[PDB]
Amino acid sequence: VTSYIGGEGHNLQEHSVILIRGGRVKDLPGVRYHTVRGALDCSGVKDRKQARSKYGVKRPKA
Amino acid sequence: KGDVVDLPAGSTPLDFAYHIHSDVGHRCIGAKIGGRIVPFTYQLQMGDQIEIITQKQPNPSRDWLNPNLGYVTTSRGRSKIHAWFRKQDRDKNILAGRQILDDELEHLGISLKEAEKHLLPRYNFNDVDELLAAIGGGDIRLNQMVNFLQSQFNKPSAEEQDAAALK
Amino acid sequence: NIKSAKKRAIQSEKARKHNASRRSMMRTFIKKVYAAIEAGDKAAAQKAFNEMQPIVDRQAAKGLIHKNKAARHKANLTAQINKLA
Amino acid sequence: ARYLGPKLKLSRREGTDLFLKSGVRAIDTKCKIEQAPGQHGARKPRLSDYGVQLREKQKVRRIYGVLERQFRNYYKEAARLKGNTGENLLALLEGRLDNVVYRMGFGATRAEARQLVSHKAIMVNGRVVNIASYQVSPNDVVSIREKAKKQSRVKAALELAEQREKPTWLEVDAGKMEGTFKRKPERSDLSADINEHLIVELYSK
RNA sequence: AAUUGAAGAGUUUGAUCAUGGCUCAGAUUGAACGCUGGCGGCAGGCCUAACACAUGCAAGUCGAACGGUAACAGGAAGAAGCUUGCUUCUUUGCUGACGAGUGGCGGACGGGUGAGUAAUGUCUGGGAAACUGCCUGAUGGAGGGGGAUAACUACUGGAAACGGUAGCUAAUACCGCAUAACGUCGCAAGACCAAAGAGGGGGACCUUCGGGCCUCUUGCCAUCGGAUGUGCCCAGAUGGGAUUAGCUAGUAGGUGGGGUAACGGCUCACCUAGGCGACGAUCCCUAGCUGGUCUGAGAGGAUGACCAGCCACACUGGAACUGAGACACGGUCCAGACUCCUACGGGAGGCAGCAGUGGGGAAUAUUGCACAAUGGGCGCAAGCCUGAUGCAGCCAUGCCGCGUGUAUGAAGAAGGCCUUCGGGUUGUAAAGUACUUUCAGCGGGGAGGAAGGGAGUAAAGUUAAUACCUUUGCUCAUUGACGUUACCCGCAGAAGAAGCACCGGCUAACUCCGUGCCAGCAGCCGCGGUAAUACGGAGGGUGCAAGCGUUAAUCGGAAUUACUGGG
RNA sequence: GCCCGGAUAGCUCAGUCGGUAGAGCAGGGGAUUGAAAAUCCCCGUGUCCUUGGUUCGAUUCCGAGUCCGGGCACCA
């Protein structure tokens, strides 16, 4: 399946190991799954401080 | 066998098999130490004796593990696993490789024999295993290879182009 | 496998041959009866019947053959022979 | 599992006193109550109907200090128990031990009555207890245990007992720091300021 | 008293009413994921690979069945070191007991798993053609012999696993003999059928001074019943496909023999030509069934994981033996694949038992402690085994509880954000002040789960018998895996205990800045094109709380399969 | 473990020979529109893997450290 990558910034490229959650875009007549940012080989979204559960970034230790 | 070998402080029993042999690491399915069987997560320490157990040859304990860079240690011995996988897909790649390769090989640069004498001593090559594996990966930096292909320069009238480049 | 209770196996074989013996024995006596029934020798067949009764029944109470099986034999055979008269 | 934050503002979300903060000051007058729970508290929202629902729930739950989940559990209790779902739910919440404690005047606030109860300070039917969600059974008694009997905060807090309307259903002697519960509070007995039927519907959706 | 309960919303249009789909609020999970994380009570935990599996444990037990004793402990006691009575050198089944072995019982229970299974299963209600060890009621018996094996030696094969030949021997092992009936067979008369002992003590009686004898206990064999379990037969119920319509030749009856514990094509031989099928046969696809769980107001729709009844399987395929009972999870024989040992002739093994490795996966734990509790196995028992079970460990995994503080505190502090810059707000929040100390933490104290069981004594029956023995009171020392228990008391100090989502409408809650159809959000409508309440950030806000989200999953809403309840 | 090579503006790519960092595509800019497209006129765009050393010129020399593609080799 084709699958969307939530948020800007994504180190993913070709191979890599990424988890897939349900849901869909509705804007990309095709995509029906989202990569799980902040989990596995997929990166947590860079510089996030709001609602990071989604995007999986750890709490800012700062 | 009484032998001992140094490792980074925080390794896994899997990795140890690689010092015995890269293929031995891939054979691994069973690990014991001091008669105590341990998970492929044990962090070896204090020169404690290993009691390896194996069978044949597969991606093994890192199949997804070290590939996931989680509890299989090192960026090194894992490379053997990495390529171990790759050569499979590479084989299929070498084939799809010759495919597209052949297209351009004679659509522009002409011949296989022409294409062969190219990469063999041009961009690092090693063997036709790799050269024909080139587009199942794009390793050489192809098209720069078509450039290595069209590396020939008769260019007399091409000077007339540069003159026109000024014109 | 591993059990000093594995002994049961050897003991059962030690029992099989024993059990098996009587079976063939019992069968032959029974056999002779049908053989005798073939002959039509109601008298001789009757005798064979007498020469099987103690055996089959003994084995029954002995536990080898049940007993209903025994009665079964004596029964249908008796039917065979009375009809043979 | 408690609000444990600026408790007074909750009064302004309701734009109403929730008796959350009694210790000294009469009118909160440090709140500018019923005017600004937040930066746009100055707003005057038409507030959706469902909003009145959610608001009522928040009111009562804020009052007893009861959190959502358990409160819902209570709701089902008001369902299968018997009689008017709303009324029962009310009396049941009143039945909360800590609520009975603050209602006995012990502790200046519901929460403070809890500060006592969790500290094993209270003894019902001559039996020490810690849990505040305790369901106070009919015709029981209770008294501050002697280890912290009448000490410090107590007497000032019980001095507050007079300022209130002093409940009918419960009993007290104070000399023994007694709290002899009797009948469960009547519907009219409670504050009545709340409209339980709303909440009834809320979960009845 | 034992059911008294049923909500709608967004969205097509310029707008409306229709029809009508898609989506949401709820309930819920054997969950995973992300962020986050205090403790506790209780439950739960490999849904995929019925994939392969190292190691340890998961079934042993009985001397009160037997010859014997391989060990230790003693006691008769040869002979010895010398403290001539200090131990000892040491011989001894002779006693407590017990290696190995024969025999009884158990291993067919317990535990696992859901592959197979569309009925040969299961659920329900029926029935007849049966068996049923252990337990039990009843009645009788329990006589009289003999022949072997193992053990054990000798020799001996073989690396091993594991046997070979020769003799030796016991038994509640085995096998005749006599004795049988309310037993079987038989119309009747007739015929046949079984088995044994062992243990405690104790008189006088009697010794080949083994003992016989007595009485107590139990074991033994038969037969009629009880109960329990088990096989079995029928009606109805028990998925999806007609883009599967014909399926069947042991097939459908009978007869006759055989076979089963028992009815029967259960199986053979001959005879009949039937048997099933649109109220779905056959075939294909999928699935273990149910009590139930889920949701729903109901009827229904989905599910059947934990606890429980049933069923089937036990590396794969197949068969049978022993036995009451298995066609046998940790038994056997055979074939296959597979792993291991090999002296390479030949052998060994099956975690889908508890844990545990690897593997697969989004994903699910400790190679823990224990026989103290119940239950089970054996033993008269005392006991022994018990990964049943009981507890502990492991993860917020579900449900539930409690805490992370309480009171005061206006100067509306600082800083932060908005400002129509004069303020508002953060916000009594903080600080500061005065308290309380559940749990954390430290140190004392400390029920219950414990009943039994052993020793003694008395009595009561038992007999000849004070005694053995059994029954009961009384007395003694005792038995806790968990467990520095639960619970309680003292202690120090607020000390160590708050995240997550959301904030355009649905739907609780707003502003400022950054970006400018880019970057990005999105469940539905949609937002983003240089003034965005929707993206990111801040503040503020709402909801929830040691959880919170996201996705997946079922039902509800959906009267969008309508029987209730539609066209 | 040793040996051999790849890393160049945002993407793809040029290079380079110890000497004074570019092409192409998107992208942004200006005209026009509310903002796009079409059309019209302009354009930039890189610590050369890092880093120091030989460096006036290293980007082409050199390892040290990076990842990346081959090859042999530890088979206890």
mmCIF file of C-alpha atoms (C1' of nucleotides) in Angstrom, chain E residues 262-563:
data_model
loop_
_atom_site.group_PDB
_atom_site.id
_atom_site.type_symbol
_atom_site.label_atom_id
_atom_site.label_comp_id
_atom_site.label_asym_id
_atom_site.label_seq_id
_atom_site.Cartn_x
_atom_site.Cartn_y
_atom_site.Cartn_z
ATOM 1 C "C1'" A E 262 -23.871 -53.990 23.292
ATOM 2 C "C1'" C E 263 -27.938 -52.610 18.854
ATOM 3 C "C1'" G E 264 -26.322 -52.577 13.548
ATOM 4 C "C1'" G E 265 -23.756 -53.338 6.749
ATOM 5 C "C1'" C E 266 -20.216 -53.233 12.168
ATOM 6 C "C1'" U E 267 -18.375 -57.087 8.625
ATOM 7 C "C1'" C E 268 -18.818 -60.966 5.172
ATOM 8 C "C1'" A E 269 -22.267 -64.531 1.517
ATOM 9 C "C1'" C E 270 -26.579 -64.823 -1.220
ATOM 10 C "C1'" C E 271 -31.359 -62.196 -2.346
ATOM 11 C "C1'" U E 272 -34.293 -57.694 -3.188
ATOM 12 C "C1'" A E 273 -33.266 -52.585 -6.014
ATOM 13 C "C1'" G E 274 -33.508 -49.696 -3.531
ATOM 14 C "C1'" G E 275 -31.216 -45.056 -0.483
ATOM 15 C "C1'" C E 276 -30.616 -39.517 -0.331
ATOM 16 C "C1'" G E 277 -32.358 -34.721 -2.972
ATOM 17 C "C1'" A E 278 -35.124 -28.268 -3.718
ATOM 18 C "C1'" C E 279 -38.102 -28.415 4.005
ATOM 19 C "C1'" G E 280 -30.693 -28.001 -0.581
ATOM 20 C "C1'" A E 281 -28.636 -34.106 -1.153
ATOM 21 C "C1'" U E 282 -23.509 -34.168 -3.255
ATOM 22 C "C1'" C E 283 -19.506 -30.781 -3.630
ATOM 23 C "C1'" C E 284 -16.708 -26.326 -2.395
ATOM 24 C "C1'" C E 285 -15.254 -22.617 1.117
ATOM 25 C "C1'" U E 286 -14.795 -21.558 6.474
ATOM 26 C "C1'" A E 287 -15.243 -23.090 11.816
ATOM 27 C "C1'" G E 288 -13.957 -26.787 17.328
ATOM 28 C "C1'" C E 289 -19.841 -26.831 20.043
ATOM 29 C "C1'" U E 290 -22.185 -24.872 24.528
ATOM 30 C "C1'" G E 291 -23.010 -22.676 29.402
ATOM 31 C "C1'" G E 292 -21.840 -17.924 27.958
ATOM 32 C "C1'" U E 293 -19.195 -12.931 26.627
ATOM 33 C "C1'" C E 294 -20.443 -8.262 23.476
ATOM 34 C "C1'" U E 295 -23.863 -4.729 22.074
ATOM 35 C "C1'" G E 296 -28.899 -3.464 21.828
ATOM 36 C "C1'" A E 297 -34.792 -1.079 25.053
ATOM 37 C "C1'" G E 298 -36.407 -5.089 22.815
ATOM 38 C "C1'" A E 299 -36.130 -8.689 18.784
ATOM 39 C "C1'" G E 300 -31.930 -9.154 17.003
ATOM 40 C "C1'" G E 301 -26.520 -8.550 15.125
ATOM 41 C "C1'" A E 302 -21.211 -10.095 16.173
ATOM 42 C "C1'" U E 303 -18.336 -13.576 19.355
ATOM 43 C "C1'" G E 304 -17.131 -18.157 22.147
ATOM 44 C "C1'" A E 305 -10.537 -15.565 25.069
ATOM 45 C "C1'" C E 306 -10.353 -16.208 30.815
ATOM 46 C "C1'" C E 307 -13.877 -19.962 34.496
ATOM 47 C "C1'" A E 308 -16.847 -24.471 33.160
ATOM 48 C "C1'" G E 309 -19.420 -29.042 30.567
ATOM 49 C "C1'" C E 310 -18.413 -31.559 25.937
ATOM 50 C "C1'" C E 311 -15.452 -32.842 21.753
ATOM 51 C "C1'" A E 312 -10.924 -33.859 18.990
ATOM 52 C "C1'" C E 313 -5.442 -33.912 18.737
ATOM 53 C "C1'" A E 314 -0.439 -35.166 21.266
ATOM 54 C "C1'" C E 315 6.395 -34.302 15.693
ATOM 55 C "C1'" U E 316 3.694 -36.529 10.510
ATOM 56 C "C1'" G E 317 1.029 -41.006 8.648
ATOM 57 C "C1'" G E 318 -0.741 -45.848 10.461
ATOM 58 C "C1'" A E 319 -1.707 -50.153 13.729
ATOM 59 C "C1'" A E 320 -2.069 -52.694 17.825
ATOM 60 C "C1'" C E 321 -0.865 -54.378 22.694
ATOM 61 C "C1'" U E 322 -1.491 -54.066 28.172
ATOM 62 C "C1'" G E 323 -5.389 -52.925 30.794
ATOM 63 C "C1'" A E 324 -11.912 -51.760 33.942
ATOM 64 C "C1'" G E 325 -10.802 -47.965 30.830
ATOM 65 C "C1'" A E 326 -6.544 -45.753 25.748
ATOM 66 C "C1'" C E 327 -6.217 -47.287 19.905
ATOM 67 C "C1'" A E 328 -2.711 -44.000 25.280
ATOM 68 C "C1'" C E 329 0.501 -36.028 25.592
ATOM 69 C "C1'" G E 330 5.944 -36.925 28.932
ATOM 70 C "C1'" G E 331 3.990 -45.965 26.740
ATOM 71 C "C1'" U E 332 4.879 -49.706 22.253
ATOM 72 C "C1'" C E 333 5.715 -51.374 17.153
ATOM 73 C "C1'" C E 334 6.214 -49.470 11.913
ATOM 74 C "C1'" A E 335 7.008 -45.555 7.749
ATOM 75 C "C1'" G E 336 8.392 -40.276 6.783
ATOM 76 C "C1'" A E 337 10.718 -35.594 7.737
ATOM 77 C "C1'" C E 338 13.678 -33.845 11.309
ATOM 78 C "C1'" U E 339 17.477 -33.036 15.507
ATOM 79 C "C1'" C E 340 21.466 -35.811 18.207
ATOM 80 C "C1'" C E 341 24.982 -39.836 19.575
ATOM 81 C "C1'" U E 342 28.520 -43.488 16.788
ATOM 82 C "C1'" A E 343 34.151 -47.291 17.842
ATOM 83 C "C1'" C E 344 29.998 -45.307 12.102
ATOM 84 C "C1'" G E 345 27.809 -52.212 12.645
ATOM 85 C "C1'" G E 346 24.054 -49.498 15.113
ATOM 86 C "C1'" G E 347 21.317 -46.401 18.446
ATOM 87 C "C1'" A E 348 18.264 -41.585 20.776
ATOM 88 C "C1'" G E 349 14.393 -37.908 21.001
ATOM 89 C "C1'" G E 350 9.202 -35.122 20.091
ATOM 90 C "C1'" C E 351 7.624 -28.186 25.339
ATOM 91 C "C1'" A E 352 0.326 -28.134 21.473
ATOM 92 C "C1'" G E 353 2.852 -30.003 30.562
ATOM 93 C "C1'" C E 354 5.514 -25.493 33.774
ATOM 94 C "C1'" A E 355 8.810 -22.424 32.977
ATOM 95 C "C1'" G E 356 12.556 -21.049 29.003
ATOM 96 C "C1'" U E 357 15.540 -20.179 23.488
ATOM 97 C "C1'" G E 358 15.013 -19.093 18.882
ATOM 98 C "C1'" G E 359 11.332 -18.021 15.097
ATOM 99 C "C1'" G E 360 6.744 -15.542 13.202
ATOM 100 C "C1'" G E 361 4.221 -11.013 14.700
ATOM 101 C "C1'" A E 362 1.373 -5.092 16.208
ATOM 102 C "C1'" A E 363 1.959 -7.737 20.128
ATOM 103 C "C1'" U E 364 1.580 -11.068 25.347
ATOM 104 C "C1'" A E 365 5.935 -12.707 31.209
ATOM 105 C "C1'" U E 366 9.881 -15.913 35.587
ATOM 106 C "C1'" U E 367 14.704 -21.488 32.788
ATOM 107 C "C1'" G E 368 10.831 -18.152 40.605
ATOM 108 C "C1'" C E 369 9.076 -20.649 45.900
ATOM 109 C "C1'" A E 370 6.401 -24.675 47.850
ATOM 110 C "C1'" C E 371 4.133 -29.320 49.355
ATOM 111 C "C1'" A E 372 1.954 -25.293 54.365
ATOM 112 C "C1'" A E 373 -4.177 -25.351 51.500
ATOM 113 C "C1'" U E 374 -7.468 -28.077 48.680
ATOM 114 C "C1'" G E 375 -7.482 -32.152 45.055
ATOM 115 C "C1'" G E 376 -5.296 -36.323 42.988
ATOM 116 C "C1'" G E 377 -1.697 -40.966 42.647
ATOM 117 C "C1'" C E 378 0.289 -45.078 45.677
ATOM 118 C "C1'" G E 379 0.659 -46.858 50.709
ATOM 119 C "C1'" C E 380 -3.805 -49.625 56.545
ATOM 120 C "C1'" A E 381 -0.937 -45.654 57.803
ATOM 121 C "C1'" A E 382 3.174 -42.532 58.898
ATOM 122 C "C1'" G E 383 4.728 -40.794 54.197
ATOM 123 C "C1'" C E 384 6.585 -40.122 49.354
ATOM 124 C "C1'" C E 385 5.386 -37.507 44.080
ATOM 125 C "C1'" U E 386 2.458 -33.512 42.579
ATOM 126 C "C1'" G E 387 5.203 -27.023 37.082
ATOM 127 C "C1'" A E 388 -2.636 -29.900 39.514
ATOM 128 C "C1'" U E 389 -2.789 -26.349 42.804
ATOM 129 C "C1'" G E 390 -1.184 -22.663 46.203
ATOM 130 C "C1'" C E 391 1.880 -18.244 46.190
ATOM 131 C "C1'" A E 392 5.890 -15.101 44.453
ATOM 132 C "C1'" G E 393 8.297 -12.604 40.190
ATOM 133 C "C1'" C E 394 7.179 -9.994 35.020
ATOM 134 C "C1'" C E 395 4.014 -5.297 31.937
ATOM 135 C "C1'" A E 396 -0.886 0.573 33.278
ATOM 136 C "C1'" U E 397 -2.862 -4.850 30.449
ATOM 137 C "C1'" G E 398 -8.350 -4.462 32.244
ATOM 138 C "C1'" C E 399 -11.334 -3.283 36.232
ATOM 139 C "C1'" C E 400 -11.277 -0.777 41.102
ATOM 140 C "C1'" G E 401 -8.914 2.302 45.122
ATOM 141 C "C1'" C E 402 -5.753 5.956 47.026
ATOM 142 C "C1'" G E 403 -1.884 9.524 46.625
ATOM 143 C "C1'" U E 404 1.317 13.235 44.253
ATOM 144 C "C1'" G E 405 -0.739 17.665 50.108
ATOM 145 C "C1'" U E 406 -3.864 20.648 53.316
ATOM 146 C "C1'" A E 407 -5.246 26.140 55.455
ATOM 147 C "C1'" U E 408 -4.024 31.190 54.858
ATOM 148 C "C1'" G E 409 -2.223 34.221 51.465
ATOM 149 C "C1'" A E 410 -3.890 41.245 46.600
ATOM 150 C "C1'" A E 411 1.296 43.896 47.409
ATOM 151 C "C1'" G E 412 -3.038 41.547 42.243
ATOM 152 C "C1'" A E 413 4.935 40.357 42.879
ATOM 153 C "C1'" A E 414 8.458 38.692 39.232
ATOM 154 C "C1'" G E 415 8.668 36.641 34.556
ATOM 155 C "C1'" G E 416 5.189 35.196 30.603
ATOM 156 C "C1'" C E 417 1.102 36.404 27.014
ATOM 157 C "C1'" C E 418 -2.761 39.782 25.167
ATOM 158 C "C1'" U E 419 -3.296 45.509 25.443
ATOM 159 C "C1'" U E 420 -8.201 49.709 22.515
ATOM 160 C "C1'" C E 421 -1.176 50.202 26.650
ATOM 161 C "C1'" G E 422 -4.557 53.431 30.523
ATOM 162 C "C1'" G E 423 -4.983 47.587 31.720
ATOM 163 C "C1'" G E 424 -6.268 42.437 31.578
ATOM 164 C "C1'" U E 425 -4.753 38.037 32.520
ATOM 165 C "C1'" U E 426 -1.594 34.301 34.474
ATOM 166 C "C1'" G E 427 -4.008 34.303 39.688
ATOM 167 C "C1'" U E 428 -4.407 32.818 45.718
ATOM 168 C "C1'" A E 429 -1.603 30.155 41.612
ATOM 169 C "C1'" A E 430 3.472 31.558 43.632
ATOM 170 C "C1'" A E 431 6.279 33.237 47.061
ATOM 171 C "C1'" G E 432 5.739 33.771 52.275
ATOM 172 C "C1'" U E 433 3.116 31.982 56.420
ATOM 173 C "C1'" A E 434 0.753 28.166 59.738
ATOM 174 C "C1'" C E 435 -0.368 22.800 59.517
ATOM 175 C "C1'" U E 436 -1.243 17.268 58.345
ATOM 176 C "C1'" U E 437 2.540 12.813 56.970
ATOM 177 C "C1'" U E 438 -2.073 7.489 53.604
ATOM 178 C "C1'" C E 439 1.559 5.590 50.416
ATOM 179 C "C1'" A E 440 6.621 6.047 49.328
ATOM 180 C "C1'" G E 441 10.916 5.699 53.200
ATOM 181 C "C1'" C E 442 13.041 3.931 58.382
ATOM 182 C "C1'" G E 443 12.424 1.284 62.754
ATOM 183 C "C1'" G E 444 9.524 -1.750 66.407
ATOM 184 C "C1'" G E 445 4.962 -4.993 67.077
ATOM 185 C "C1'" G E 446 2.133 -8.701 64.241
ATOM 186 C "C1'" A E 447 -4.172 -12.223 63.309
ATOM 187 C "C1'" G E 448 -5.733 -15.487 59.739
ATOM 188 C "C1'" G E 449 -5.330 -18.974 56.245
ATOM 189 C "C1'" A E 450 -4.061 -24.782 60.662
ATOM 190 C "C1'" A E 451 -7.773 -28.705 59.595
ATOM 191 C "C1'" G E 452 -4.910 -32.268 60.587
ATOM 192 C "C1'" G E 453 -1.076 -35.431 61.773
ATOM 193 C "C1'" G E 454 2.391 -37.729 65.565
ATOM 194 C "C1'" A E 455 3.227 -39.317 71.278
ATOM 195 C "C1'" G E 456 0.469 -40.340 75.685
ATOM 196 C "C1'" U E 457 -3.840 -41.561 78.647
ATOM 197 C "C1'" A E 458 -8.977 -42.991 79.624
ATOM 198 C "C1'" A E 459 -13.032 -45.066 77.831
ATOM 199 C "C1'" A E 460 -15.850 -47.797 74.565
ATOM 200 C "C1'" G E 461 -16.634 -51.627 71.771
ATOM 201 C "C1'" U E 462 -12.905 -56.644 70.226
ATOM 202 C "C1'" U E 463 -11.846 -61.144 71.771
ATOM 203 C "C1'" A E 464 -9.720 -65.686 76.097
ATOM 204 C "C1'" A E 465 -6.992 -61.528 76.642
ATOM 205 C "C1'" U E 466 -4.694 -56.788 80.855
ATOM 206 C "C1'" A E 467 -2.496 -56.083 75.458
ATOM 207 C "C1'" C E 468 -2.590 -55.408 69.843
ATOM 208 C "C1'" C E 469 -6.531 -52.775 67.300
ATOM 209 C "C1'" U E 470 -10.535 -49.361 66.173
ATOM 210 C "C1'" U E 471 -13.643 -45.309 67.891
ATOM 211 C "C1'" U E 472 -13.893 -40.699 71.352
ATOM 212 C "C1'" G E 473 -12.606 -37.114 75.075
ATOM 213 C "C1'" C E 474 -8.298 -35.331 77.557
ATOM 214 C "C1'" U E 475 -2.419 -33.995 77.628
ATOM 215 C "C1'" C E 476 2.213 -32.890 75.172
ATOM 216 C "C1'" A E 477 5.654 -31.240 71.579
ATOM 217 C "C1'" U E 478 4.467 -29.734 66.488
ATOM 218 C "C1'" U E 479 3.625 -28.475 60.915
ATOM 219 C "C1'" G E 480 3.148 -21.335 57.072
ATOM 220 C "C1'" A E 481 5.202 -21.773 50.364
ATOM 221 C "C1'" C E 482 3.650 -16.659 50.776
ATOM 222 C "C1'" G E 483 6.238 -13.452 54.656
ATOM 223 C "C1'" U E 484 11.574 -8.047 56.371
ATOM 224 C "C1'" U E 485 2.742 -10.916 55.621
ATOM 225 C "C1'" A E 486 -2.246 -8.307 55.847
ATOM 226 C "C1'" C E 487 -2.908 -5.209 59.591
ATOM 227 C "C1'" C E 488 -0.830 -1.835 63.622
ATOM 228 C "C1'" C E 489 2.393 1.729 66.286
ATOM 229 C "C1'" G E 490 6.568 5.226 66.381
ATOM 230 C "C1'" C E 491 9.553 7.981 63.047
ATOM 231 C "C1'" A E 492 11.691 12.340 59.496
ATOM 232 C "C1'" G E 493 9.855 15.953 56.170
ATOM 233 C "C1'" A E 494 5.749 18.299 52.172
ATOM 234 C "C1'" A E 495 9.476 15.973 51.550
ATOM 235 C "C1'" G E 496 9.469 11.508 46.373
ATOM 236 C "C1'" A E 497 4.918 11.270 43.391
ATOM 237 C "C1'" A E 498 1.188 14.925 36.535
ATOM 238 C "C1'" G E 499 0.839 13.678 32.371
ATOM 239 C "C1'" C E 500 -2.192 13.314 27.521
ATOM 240 C "C1'" A E 501 -5.696 14.908 24.008
ATOM 241 C "C1'" C E 502 -8.296 18.663 22.331
ATOM 242 C "C1'" C E 503 -9.562 24.265 21.814
ATOM 243 C "C1'" G E 504 -13.383 26.586 13.016
ATOM 244 C "C1'" G E 505 -18.865 23.360 12.863
ATOM 245 C "C1'" C E 506 -20.117 18.363 14.528
ATOM 246 C "C1'" U E 507 -18.317 19.148 20.252
ATOM 247 C "C1'" A E 508 -16.846 21.197 25.866
ATOM 248 C "C1'" A E 509 -12.739 25.673 24.745
ATOM 249 C "C1'" C E 510 -9.674 31.787 22.285
ATOM 250 C "C1'" U E 511 -6.356 35.229 21.262
ATOM 251 C "C1'" C E 512 -1.231 36.749 19.432
ATOM 252 C "C1'" C E 513 3.050 35.510 16.268
ATOM 253 C "C1'" G E 514 5.321 32.483 12.161
ATOM 254 C "C1'" U E 515 4.353 30.453 7.466
ATOM 255 C "C1'" G E 516 1.221 32.578 2.783
ATOM 256 C "C1'" C E 517 -2.910 26.692 -1.577
ATOM 257 C "C1'" C E 518 4.067 26.619 0.589
ATOM 258 C "C1'" A E 519 4.914 24.210 4.994
ATOM 259 C "C1'" G E 520 1.210 21.435 6.945
ATOM 260 C "C1'" C E 521 -4.129 19.444 9.487
ATOM 261 C "C1'" A E 522 -8.205 16.307 8.292
ATOM 262 C "C1'" G E 523 -13.268 11.085 11.394
ATOM 263 C "C1'" C E 524 -17.115 13.953 8.220
ATOM 264 C "C1'" C E 525 -17.649 18.901 6.282
ATOM 265 C "C1'" G E 526 -13.051 21.060 5.162
ATOM 266 C "C1'" C E 527 -9.131 24.814 6.510
ATOM 267 C "C1'" G E 528 -3.921 26.906 4.298
ATOM 268 C "C1'" G E 529 -3.511 31.731 -2.013
ATOM 269 C "C1'" U E 530 0.183 38.051 3.032
ATOM 270 C "C1'" A E 531 -4.873 40.015 8.808
ATOM 271 C "C1'" A E 532 -5.815 31.718 9.467
ATOM 272 C "C1'" U E 533 -10.464 31.155 16.143
ATOM 273 C "C1'" A E 534 -8.509 24.914 11.672
ATOM 274 C "C1'" C E 535 -1.080 24.407 9.849
ATOM 275 C "C1'" G E 536 3.544 25.399 13.674
ATOM 276 C "C1'" G E 537 4.770 28.112 18.182
ATOM 277 C "C1'" A E 538 3.221 30.846 22.696
ATOM 278 C "C1'" G E 539 -0.311 32.097 26.147
ATOM 279 C "C1'" G E 540 -4.705 31.070 27.662
ATOM 280 C "C1'" G E 541 -8.754 27.260 27.619
ATOM 281 C "C1'" U E 542 -11.648 22.601 27.877
ATOM 282 C "C1'" G E 543 -11.909 17.673 28.865
ATOM 283 C "C1'" C E 544 -9.407 13.323 31.510
ATOM 284 C "C1'" A E 545 -6.335 11.559 34.905
ATOM 285 C "C1'" A E 546 -1.645 7.519 36.232
ATOM 286 C "C1'" G E 547 -3.361 7.569 32.559
ATOM 287 C "C1'" C E 548 -3.992 9.731 27.757
ATOM 288 C "C1'" G E 549 -4.101 9.469 22.704
ATOM 289 C "C1'" U E 550 -4.018 6.908 17.739
ATOM 290 C "C1'" U E 551 -5.201 2.653 14.801
ATOM 291 C "C1'" A E 552 -7.582 -1.990 14.665
ATOM 292 C "C1'" A E 553 -12.330 -4.722 16.230
ATOM 293 C "C1'" U E 554 -18.058 -5.572 17.263
ATOM 294 C "C1'" C E 555 -22.725 -3.702 18.253
ATOM 295 C "C1'" G E 556 -25.506 0.980 18.873
ATOM 296 C "C1'" G E 557 -26.999 5.063 16.520
ATOM 297 C "C1'" A E 558 -28.432 2.569 10.927
ATOM 298 C "C1'" A E 559 -36.421 1.844 10.558
ATOM 299 C "C1'" U E 560 -29.099 2.391 5.534
ATOM 300 C "C1'" U E 561 -31.867 -5.978 5.155
ATOM 301 C "C1'" A E 562 -37.144 -3.370 8.422
ATOM 302 C "C1'" C E 563 -39.653 -10.233 12.560
#
